[PDB]
Design brief:
The structure is cut from a larger assembly and holds 8 protein chains of 8 kinds. With about 140 residues, chain A is mainly alpha-helical. Chain A has 5 helices and no strands. The chains are: A mainly alpha (about 140), B alpha+beta (about 100), C mainly alpha (about 210), D little secondary structure (about 35), E mainly beta (about 60), F mainly alpha (about 140), G alpha+beta (about 130), H alpha+beta (about 60). Chains F and G meet through loops of F and loops of G. Chain A binds 2 RNA strands through loops. Chain E: One of its GO terms (molecular function) is structural constituent of ribosome.
RNA sequence: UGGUAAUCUUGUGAAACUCCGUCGUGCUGGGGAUAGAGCAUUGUAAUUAUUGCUCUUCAACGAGGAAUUCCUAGUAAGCGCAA
RNA sequence: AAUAGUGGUGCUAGCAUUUGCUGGUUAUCCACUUCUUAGAGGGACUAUCGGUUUCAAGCCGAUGGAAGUUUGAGGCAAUAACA
């Protein structure tokens, strides 16, 4: 195509909720480095971000790093269907949310520990597997 | 005086060329309109079963076969001509059918 | 030469010298080059070729094996493991993408650069494939010419796979540099420097 | 069904005949099956 | 280099633990009166050209 | 000096045609084109962000050209892939139907292809005087 | 009426019927010109019957062939079986035999399997 | 991130014999698409004398 | 709706392969092995997931020591997905 | 040979058009079997030449030929301790 030569300004470390991104890659591959979001999930949000689909970290506008979590923290606000989510129709509140990197471990232990010890709403013979053979 | 159709689907190929000959024989001694005996692709049946009553031994199998041949003739004649001759061409193992389909 | 027309609109460029006695769509067979006296008999099948792909019937007597073309033989050897058994169409794409990259590397005839190359790589001497009856030794022996050409081509081929395994460069980039390395006596390519040391210990053992 | 010869399994459900295959090899003749190849 | 340009005349038989080598009768082109055998390995027939190095030291027969 | 549909390129003829259709913009493009892929067997929505909807809609007209009729079950069993199952062996692809149901209906609005009495949707003289005529407009792309 | 004949060529259960007519010279592979066959590398295999005798004898011909069966590779071999033997039926019904044999010798000097199809059918396994 | 894509390529192009993706990846910073876009820019520049090209590879030499 | 059978499903538009692209050699977009949230169907009944589609998670695994092989020229191997 | 197929005559749409190349379908009708299917037969015997051998049984080349590895692959064939 052509030779575009920008003045570096590229961040080897990012800060999106304790996620430090080696941003010399495609931005849809940049978000996949966090947990809870993969290329089947991160595909549409950059298409929702309405940017170029080939950029690196050295050329991103500074509002967009706020924007990408803003669409993330408001998932159903900007036309995300029900079949595009992780956590769905919860046993505690029934609502539907998605998860970031450092909190997939949230709604994980407490939701298994009831099946581990309390003989919960369904977990009474699902009670030894992650306890005796897979603890 | 109606166009008819006869089928015969048997499994003794020697005993199907005598019948299909005398069908076209007595029709042509009365010289009706006809079209020749169209011979269809035959059908074979098969079942693989291994060759032991118990299970203890080496393994390869059988393969059984059964062959079905089928051919059919169309015809037109007055009904008095045909209703006698279809009752004198009987033979065991052989099936005969009459179809008068004139839609 | 007088491009006639039909009801089919036919392109001229398939008719210019192709209707003339030049046969292959970019090269010819006028260039006949003999280096060894062994290769005079069977390797240069003097017949035309256009695509280097036909259904040869040579595998039912061991000397009709000789009459297949050389270019057909090297494509056959490209089926190497359990991923390319039967991908002949992939192979001819590789080969017709290698003579182009030969002739642009400062030379004169892309079919020449392999027929001289196999003159070097037909091993003049040999070990024996025997132990000896306990004393695992190696005795005096020589090689038949029709056996000589067989292992000559094949050791050139197998070096290219690891030469193009897991590195950025492609197959056609390997086959370019390998054959011009094989064209001269350099012993810098793996296609050469494993047949040499075979012959050197064969100069010992005997 | 269990037909005869210590079998309720390996039945030949195909072609609508329903024979235990231990007791098919001895009955396949008179049905009109024969081996040829 | 000391070449030895040779031509096979008569085929005799295979010999070896497996018969993997064959003893033939070969002729030298540059001296057409050189009757000599050679333990050639490979598919062999009449009228072949044989590169060779050691023109005299050769096993006349094998076990 | 006059051609049919049958004597042009295959891949290139779609490209010149859909780019003209890219200038048209007369397509009911639904909202969920960003999310829903072509089938289940594929892994990703395509690298084309926009023109893929022009791509499939062009070639489905290209396939009813030689044919008599097309239903919907046929182009389900058509679309070029192999279903991965993971560690288990493969199986053939079957394509989704909602993304083909409307795009077949999206050409009745522009007079191309309509229902035969035999039971499939086919071209009539609407396309047979125009779709060939704009296939005749691809003859300018031959030079 | 018009000089017209039929030939056919097979390879590995893939047929290729041929219709020969007389005209300006159109060579139609299943309703398309011959210069568009999708194995682009094997495009010159079909050119081989035409590019052996010169482009002369075809302002009085018309060729329409159609195929069934086989894969994407055998059908390239099937069409040039019927086409090459399709030309000789003119020269074995209308034009003389000295014109026949000169191209008969020209074909079979170059390819025995341009006139006579192969005989290498498959084989049943673990039976 | 301004000069390394500016001097070794815009000036030192015609030094070689031919051009492929092999020469362009000799720098460990010029990645796959970066080496790909090099010829994609240079074909507009007319230095490339093309020989053959398809989707897997091209055969390109300089002017 | 069509199909008791060359008529209908069914040309069983199978896959590898085939062009045009994107990708760039790092165990990365190779490889998805344990998993949690969900929607469906089949029967009297699927928890100890009978199976199937969603999104997540991506963990052993860089060609294999000593040893040792149902498969023969349209053969050996890949590629099927019919009963 | 409307339970296969082409070849026309048509109704009929494109048609660059201008002779033309693609369509059109029940029944527009007639004429056809090459391809297709199934009955009846034919065809290969190692044929014909050249070597080789006790000149014997045969084995190697050769050109012809749809076919020249028992022409390719199978089915079928009873002496015996697995109580």
């Amino acid at each position: 195509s052509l030779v575009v030569q920008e003045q570096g300004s590229f961040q080897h470390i990012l800060r999106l909720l304790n996620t430090n991104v080696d941003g010399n890659i495609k931005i849809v591959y940049a978000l996949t480095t966090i947990k809870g979001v993969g290329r089947r999930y991160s595909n549409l949000v950059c298409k929702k971000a309405d940017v170029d689909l080939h950029k690196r970290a050295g050329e991103l506008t500074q509002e967009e790093l706020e924007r990408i979590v803003q669409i993330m923290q408001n998932p159903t606000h900007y036309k995300i269907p029900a079949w595009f989510l992780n956590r769905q129709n919860d046993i505690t509140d029934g609502k539907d949310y998605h998860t970031l990197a450092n909190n997939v471990e949230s709604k994980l232990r407490d939701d298994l520990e009831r099946l581990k010890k309390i003989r919960a709403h369904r977990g009474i013979r699902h009670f030894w597997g992650l306890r005796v053979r897979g603890q | 005086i109606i166009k008819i159709r006869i089928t015969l689907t048997s499994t003794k190929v020697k005993q199907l060329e005598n019948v299909s000959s005398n069908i076209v024989k007595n029709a042509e001694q009365h010289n009706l309109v006809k079209k020749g005996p169209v011979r269809l692709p035959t059908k074979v049946l098969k079942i693989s079963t291994r060759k032991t009553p118990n299970g203890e031994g080496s393994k390869t199998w059988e393969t059984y076969e059964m062959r079905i041949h089928k051919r059919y003739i169309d015809l037109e004649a007055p009904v008095q001509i045909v209703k006698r001759i279809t009752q004198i061409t009987i033979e065991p193992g052989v099936d005969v059918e009459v179809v008068v389909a004139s839609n | 030469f007088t491009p006639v027309v039909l009801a089919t609109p036919i392109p001229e460029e398939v008719q210019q010298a192709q209707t003339e006695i030049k046969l292959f769509n970019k090269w010819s067979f006028e260039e006949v080059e003999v280096k060894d006296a062994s290769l005079v008999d069977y390797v240069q099948v003097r017949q035309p070729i256009f695509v280097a792909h036909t259904a040869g019937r040579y595998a039912n007597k061991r000397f009709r094996k000789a009459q297949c073309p050389i270019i057909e033989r090297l494509t056959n050897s490209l089926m190497m493991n359990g991923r390319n058994n039967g991908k002949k169409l992939k192979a001819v794409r590789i080969i017709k993408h290698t003579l182009d990259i030969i002739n642009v590397l400062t030379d004169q005839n892309p079919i020449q650069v392999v027929v001289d190359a196999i003159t070097n790589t037909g091993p003049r001497e040999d070990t024996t494939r025997v132990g000896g009856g306990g004393a695992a030794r190696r005795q005096a022996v020589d090689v038949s010419p029709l056996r000589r050409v067989n292992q000559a081509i094949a050791l050139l081929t197998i070096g290219a796979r690891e030469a193009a395994f897991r590195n950025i460069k492609t197959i056609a980039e390997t086959l370019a540099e390998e054959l011009i390395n094989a064209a001269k006596g350099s012993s810098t390519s793996y296609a050469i420097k494993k047949k040499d040391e075979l012959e050197r210990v064969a100069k010992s053992n005997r | 069904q269990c037909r005869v010869c210590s079998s309720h399994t390996g039945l030949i459900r195909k072609y609508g005949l329903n024979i235990c295959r231990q007791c098919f090899r001895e009955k396949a003749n008179d049905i009109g099956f024969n081996k040829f190849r | 280099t000391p070449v030895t340009l040779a031509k096979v005349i008569k085929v005799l038989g295979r010999t070896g633990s497996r018969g993997g080598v064959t003893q033939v009768r070969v002729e030298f082109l540059e001296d057409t009166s050189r009757t000599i055998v050679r333990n050639v390995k490979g598919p062999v027939r009449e009228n072949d050209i044989l590169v060779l190095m050691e023109s005299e030291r050769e096993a006349r027969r094998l076990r | 000096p006059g051609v049919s549909v049958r004597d042009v390129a295959a891949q290139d003829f779609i490209n010149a045609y859909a780019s003209f259709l890219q200038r048209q913009g007369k397509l009911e493009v639904p909202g969920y084109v960003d999310i829903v892929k072509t089938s289940s067997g594929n892994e990703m929505p395509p690298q084309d962000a926009e023109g893929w909807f022009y791509k499939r809609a062009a070639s489905v007209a290209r396939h009813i050209y030689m044919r008599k009729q097309v239903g919907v079950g046929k182009l389900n069993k058509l679309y070029g892939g192999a279903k991965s199952r993971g560690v288990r062996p493969y199986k053939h692809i079957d394509a989704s139907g909602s993304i083909n149901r409307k795009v077949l209906q999206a050409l009745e609005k522009i007079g191309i292809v309509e229902i035969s009495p035999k039971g499939g949707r086919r071209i009539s003289e609407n396309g047979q005087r125009d779709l060939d005529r704009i296939a005749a407009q691809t003859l300018e792309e031959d030079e | 009426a018009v000089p017209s004949v039929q030939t056919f060529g097979k390879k590995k259960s893939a047929t290729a019927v041929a219709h020969v007519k007389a005209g300006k010279g159109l060579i139609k592979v299943n309703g398309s010109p011959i210069t568009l066959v999708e194995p682009e590398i094997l495009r010159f295999k079909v050119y081989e019957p035409l590019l052996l005798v010169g482009l002369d004898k075809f302002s009085n011909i018309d060729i329409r062939v159609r195929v069934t069966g086989g894969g994407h590779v055998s059908q390239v071999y099937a069409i040039r079986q019927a086409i090459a033997k399709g030309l000789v039926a003119y020269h074995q019904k209308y034009v003389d035999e000295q014109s026949k044999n000169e191209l008969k010798k020209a074909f079979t000097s170059y390819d025995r399997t341009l006139l006579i199809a192969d005989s290498r059918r498959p084989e049943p396994k673990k039976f | 991130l301004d000069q390394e894509k500016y001097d070794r390529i815009l000036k030192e192009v015609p030094t070689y014999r031919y051009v492929s993706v092999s020469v362009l990846v000799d720098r460990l910073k010029i990645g796959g698409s970066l080496a790909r876009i090099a010829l994609r820019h240079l074909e507009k520049e007319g230095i490339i004398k093309p020989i053959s090209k398809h989707s897997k590879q091209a055969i390109y030499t300089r002017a």
